[PDB]
Ligand binder design. Structure first.
Ligand SMILES: Nc1nc2c(ncn2[C@@H]2O[C@H](COP(=O)(O)OP(=O)(O)O)[C@@H](O)[C@H]2O)c(=O)[nH]1
Ligand SMILES: Nc1nc2c(ncn2[C@@H]2O[C@H](COP(=O)(O)OP(=O)(O)O)[C@@H](O)[C@H]2O)c(=O)[nH]1
Ligand code: BEF
Ligand code: BEF
Ligand SMILES: [K+]
Ligand SMILES: [K+]
Ligand SMILES: [Mg+2]
Ligand SMILES: [Mg+2]
Lengths: 390, 387
């Protein structure tokens, strides 16, 4: 006994550590602020120190929330028409989300499991379990009037009996295309930035753009190094021009590897192997939506979608301790290290009237005692990593 | 004749721009002197100085663009929207590297030649190499051992085969935008100063801001860009016909908003004849069959590619005076108007202090030189750009 209990122990442990962390950094932020702003002190603490510590307080509050959340959030991200909606529709075995040519998905869509045997949707502040067939009115931009305003979230519920993956506490998120408008991008941040796992749906007819990559650098800048699956979707395109298939596949694989391993430095090359796939959502959906001449390599592309689903499931369940917590604990260690440096910098600055020197040594004592609280927390995080991680 | 009308126009406008450039260099020096003078803060502002310096630069580069022997048409777009394939369709053969993934990994001039065989030339080589060598130089799944520099291969296609090339026309196939920073900086160096742009958009998707940002950059550095938008891959709309008209409407509205509201380069009626829905792949396939079941509406998409080619040809031949010069003359009028405002602002701000009235007199005399140039530009526009 048991996978579930191992997770709940881990959650209580790390959440409790992060409580201590957040109060520590808030206190240190107030100390540094006070020292910087005091007109009596010859530049003891710097503005940069203050901004960094304030940034860390914010960072840690948001990460705190992410840790304590009841659910594992998976955000789907990509350019317009790479295949985000269609990938989810394939995982669900039915065309249940708005999909098509042009800009379509014009709202954010939660997808969760339900114990009931029928699907439904719910809208901002409504108990009403509306028909899943109403989606287009709310989420499909060829239906929606161009006036409709700044939000939104529509929560789709799909029966757990159909679709294994939705059990339990998993939440999939279909979003709009990146880089369509500034406002849409700011909403894509608000909704998707704090996701536990990202599925980058790339267009395998094309290659990876920098605006697509920039998002994941932003995730790291604001929170922690992102857990990323790359689906090179539309791979059925390579059935035309088989004389280059392997060369094109090699190009994508090399570029995606470079993105995860060299640019983000989130994963090593061997790990990245099991995060990059070549698939056709369209084919998988078409085949699945049928069990009451085929295009070449269909079966290979199907088997890789299945591998993606297997590995995706292995992470949000078996390795949910790792998936939910690891990257945030690493970032916690990093932030603490920098906080220690700031406290040291303030201490040494303090070394260079009787009331004025007495005030200055009080800053020294404060900075040292904060420093050792930081080392205590570093040890508690190191213990957590030992007892709960590889 | 048409040719003589053009050469007259070129000599006229180039001569005007010489006068323009000297005027703005002088005004830039005046504004700089007034701003930097410690006796007289705050008569001219830093923003005034930066604007005037920017205008000097702008005008030098536009001067060069005006005085060039050839009409350059740059093809621009995302990776795999269909740039290479559009050109391959215009030439009736698969002559340029095309395929899934990142392919076009150098810049490719395409010009007419009087000879009956096609060929290529590389920097800096007399050798007319076989057009069948292209892939080794330009196709990123092929390319031989190094290479790079961000370079140019000049393709020459027989004029006998493709009507459009017979002028001093130069088509430019480029790499995909937003792939790498260095590729983007080369795309600027090569394509930014193009006389005409063909934006090959992916009609399965919608227009991204990185795609639009390029053309804002053209405007920031030079003049509002002459832009054709080809919504390529439109054969995709065969698969989902119940929304075809709605998707078409979406693209048309977005493209219209881009040209008319965002760039403010053209009115809605003009923009109608700059936006098209086509399948390069289909057109190439049909044409290369010179050398049973076809998709609907193949024929519609073909007729629109043909309309694009007709209107494209009507512009860099019949209306070549317009195409080459108009947008630069408009920008010239705009800059002069703002220069006038700067000189007025300095004059009013000016309201031992003999020095102060000397700035007033200088600002007024510069202002009236600006009005003289405005009239010379207005005369040019009357005589060479009706109605
Ligand atoms: N051939 C092919 N078409 C696809 C694939 N995935 C999606 N599509 C098509 O491209 C469009 C996808 O739009 P969609 O991705 O659902 O909306 P998004 O949210 O903007 O990505 C639809 O018209 C799909 O039929 C694929 O793997 N292969
Ligand atoms: N279905 C379809 N495919 C196209 C069209 N235009 C180009 N393609 C294909 O899309 C792929 C990319 O074309 P390419 O011209 O290399 O794109 P570029 O690198 O952006 O110039 C090739 O395999 C082409 O055959 C089109 O209008 N419809
Ligand atoms: F066409 Be989408 F859902 F960005
Ligand atoms: F496929 Be590209 F525009 F290099
Ligand atoms: K779409
Ligand atoms: K390509
Ligand atoms: Mg979608
Ligand atoms: Mg190309």
């Amino acid at each position: 006994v048991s996978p579930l209990k191992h997770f709940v122990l881990a959650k209580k442990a790390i959440t409790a550590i992060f409580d201590q962390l957040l109060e520590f950094v808030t206190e240190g932020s107030h100390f540094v602020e006070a020292t910087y702003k005091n007109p009596e002190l010859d530049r003891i603490a710097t503005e940069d120190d203050l901004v960094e510590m304030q940034g860390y307080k914010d960072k840690l509050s948001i990460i705190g929330e992410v840790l304590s959340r009841r659910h594992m959030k998976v955000a789907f991200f990509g350019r317009t028409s790479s295949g985000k909606s269609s990938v989810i529709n394939a995982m669900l075995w039915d065309k249940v989300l708005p999909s098509g040519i042009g800009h379509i998905t014009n709202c954010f869509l939660s997808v969760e499991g339900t114990d009931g045997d029928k699907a439904y949707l719910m809208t901002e502040g409504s108990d009403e379990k509306k028909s899943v067939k109403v989606n287009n009115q709310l989420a499909h931009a060829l239906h929606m009037d161009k006036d409709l305003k700044a939000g939104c979230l529509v929560r789709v519920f799909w029966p757990k009996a159909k679709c294994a993956l939705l059990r339990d506490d998993l939440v999939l998120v279909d979003s709009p295309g990146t880089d369509v408008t500034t406002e849409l991008d700011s909403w894509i941040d608000k909704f998707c930035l704090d996701a536990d796992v990202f599925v980058l749906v790339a267009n395998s007819e094309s290659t990876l753009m920098n605006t697509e990559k920039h998002f994941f650098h932003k995730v790291n800048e604001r929170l922690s190094k992102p857990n990323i699956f790359i689906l090179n979707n539309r791979w059925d395109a390579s059935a035309s021009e088989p004389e280059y298939m392997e060369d094109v596949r090699r190009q994508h694989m090399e570029r995606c590897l470079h993105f995860l391993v060299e640019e983000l430095k989130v994963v090593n090359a061997l790990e990245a192997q099991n995060r990059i796939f070549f698939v056709s959502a369209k084919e998988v959906l078409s085949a699945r939506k049928q069990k009451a001449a085929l295009a070449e390599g269909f079966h290979a592309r199907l088997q890789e979608f299945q591998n993606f689903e297997q590995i995706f499931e292995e992470c949000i369940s078996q390795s949910a301790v790792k998936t939910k917590f690891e990257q945030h604990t690493i970032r916690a260690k990093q932030i603490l290290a920098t906080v220690k440096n700031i406290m040291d910098s303030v201490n040494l600055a303090a070394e260079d009237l009787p009331k004025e020197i007495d005030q200055l040594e009080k800053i020294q004592n404060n900075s040292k005692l904060l420093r050792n609280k930081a080392v205590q927390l570093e040890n508690e995080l190191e213990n957590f990593t030992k007892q709960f991680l590889p």
